[PDB]
Amino acid sequence: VLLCKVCGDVASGFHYGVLACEGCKGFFRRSIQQNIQYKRCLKNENCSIVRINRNRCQQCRFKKCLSVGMSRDAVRFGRIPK
Amino acid sequence: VLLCKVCGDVASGFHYGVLACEGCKGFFRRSIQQNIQYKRCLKNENCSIVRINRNRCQQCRFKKCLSVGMSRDAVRFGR
DNA sequence: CAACTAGGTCACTAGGTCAG
DNA sequence: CTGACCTAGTGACCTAGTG
Ligand SMILES: [Zn+2]
Ligand SMILES: [Zn+2]
Ligand SMILES: [Zn+2]
Ligand SMILES: [Zn+2]
């Protein structure tokens, strides 16, 4: 089926331009709205965001959402076409 | 080819007397065929209306619909 | 009769909620 | 402070009717 582009979980839809799970849809919006910076990464700027460890590090997570393409400008309402 | 007058998206026909997109087409019908009470624009009632942000401000988008000439009494059926 | 569109449908999503 | 779950809307598609 649908896989979340950011953590690999099951995608619940197409959100902000990329298929994503409900957890990352909310996280992203949440972040990109009521904005504020996230604590500093506790490793190298690369933490493998996965279904089980996605919440362990917000900085690399949010960074990953943008990474894959999420934004308010890539929204697509309605049915899916071709 | 053709474009929507309200948002510049691909027009799909002459709706309410103005080349419009399916999006703006239905949005307009939904507006004037309902208890039109759009929350006042949150940002200086001069919000631009393009493909990327057409859903961001309803009051404006609708305002842009009437602004470009749409209305039920401007409808046309064949040309 | 063909060309073309207003509605009506309903597949889909952004945001709001609120119990973990 | 995360994410399953609802709802208010959005717009792709279809078709009843309309020189
Ligand atoms: Zn995810
Ligand atoms: Zn990290
Ligand atoms: Zn439009
Ligand atoms: Zn506005």
Side-chain angles (χ1 to χ4, degrees), chain A residues 64-81:
Chain A
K64 180 73 173 305
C65 304
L66 298 174
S67 180
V68 297
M70 302 173 84
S71 81
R72 292 183 171 296
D73 298 321
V75 171
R76 173 200 61 57
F77 285 101
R79 182 198 286 90
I80 318 176

Side-chain angles (χ1 to χ4, degrees), chain A residues 39 41-43 46-50:
Chain A
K39 307 163 198 168
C41 182
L42 315 188
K43 301 290 187 176
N46 286 301
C47 302
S48 50
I49 310 308
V50 186

Side-chain angles (χ1 to χ4, degrees), chain A residues 4 6-9 20-24 54 61:
Chain A
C4 171
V6 184
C7 80
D9 208 322
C21 54
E22 272 296 314
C24 304
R54 66 193 178 213
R61 187 178 195 181

